[PDB]
Design an enzyme around this catalytic site. Structure first.
Site, PDB file in Angstrom:
ATOM      1  CB  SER A  96      -7.465  41.819   0.526  1.00  0.00           C
ATOM      2  OG  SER A  96      -8.706  41.340   1.008  1.00  0.00           O
ATOM      3  CE  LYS A 139      -7.506  38.134   0.504  1.00  0.00           C
ATOM      4  NZ  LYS A 139      -6.433  37.318   1.122  1.00  0.00           N
TER       5      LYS A 139
END
Lengths: 145, 72
Positions: A96, A139
């Site tokens: 990611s 995130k």
């Protein structure tokens, strides 16, 4: 810790890496090693194949942007590459943070230190496209916290 | 998804593929980095080599059809 996580001075080959523990969103920052050799791409620290091909996509984007970034004209074939994440392999959906590896190897290959307070994560395409992240929430928490 | 992922704009270097996983078929955006060098089949994406030789039949057809498509 230093308080703001940006008291690190701008660093060759190292950027702040928004990634996910199962504990959660964490600064799994990026550690690279680019030395002359055969152009080989080692993944150091139990880094999985999806990280390997992410490094390939970053590598080939740099190949597409070589004199764009002032790089040596042959770098993928004679500079051995060795990269780390403190997490062994990402249990989440790929790394990611393919652009995080891209940024660190860019700062490494430029011999020019990339900045800190880097709040970033995302997936490079070999076509050259930042794929959207699944789970923007933790995130960007790992950024903001 | 956008108003229509089929109505996504035309893409250099990649194409809308057709799949059938047993749970369901998908678009297959088969992406290719035309990286310079001398010819090195830098295949990836857990790629089985029958797709490699499919791309090689494609490659030698492009070798046959270099001036069909203005190729060097």
């Amino acid at each position: 810790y230093r308080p703001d996580k940006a008291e690190t001075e701008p660093q060759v080959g190292t950027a702040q890496g928004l990634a996910w523990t199962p504990v959660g969103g964490t600064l799994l920052t990026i550690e690279v090693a680019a030395v002359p050799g055969s152009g080989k791409l080692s993944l150091t620290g139990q880094l999985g194949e999806v990280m390997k091909e992410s490094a390939q996509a970053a590598l080939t984007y740099l190949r597409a942007h070589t004199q764009d970034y002032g790089l040596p004209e042959d770098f993928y074939n004679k500079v051995d590459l060795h990269v780390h994440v403190p997490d062994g392999a990402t249990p989440k959906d790929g790394p990611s943070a393919g652009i995080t590896m891209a940024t660190a190897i860019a700062s490494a290959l430029s011999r020019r230190p990339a900045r800190m307070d880097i709040a970033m994560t995302g997936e490079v395409s070999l076509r050259g496209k930042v794929m959207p992240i699944g789970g923007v929430k933790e995130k960007l928490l790992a950024a903001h916290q």
